[PDB]
């Protein structure tokens, strides 16, 4: 075990494309986005 989001420094504009997100995480967002997009879809279809 260990914690405090390690000991990393910020990212520079350059960094993009030479350091990418955590596969795991991305999905999570990827998932999350859709859901809100669906329930909210459910919402429209249903409320109307």
């Amino acid at each position: 075990s260990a914690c405090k989001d390690s000991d990393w420094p910020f990212c520079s504009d350059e960094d993009w494309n030479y350091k990418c997100p955590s596969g795991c995480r991305m999905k999570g967002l990827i998932d999350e986005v859709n859901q809100d997009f669906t329930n909210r879809i459910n919402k429209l279809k249903n409320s109307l």
């Binding site: 993009w16 494309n17 350091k19 990418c20 997100p21 955590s22 596969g23 991305m26 967002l29 990827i30 986005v33 997009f37 909210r40 429209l44």
Partner: protein, 40 residues
Amino acid sequence: DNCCILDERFGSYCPTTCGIADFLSTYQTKVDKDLQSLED
């Protein structure tokens, strides 16, 4: 699994977490656009 192979030593090739996010960043936003726009 492999199909995008481009150097057997390194096997199949995929996109980048980077290329993905942006695709989302583009993806997601345009989505909401039409949405919020219709929500009105």
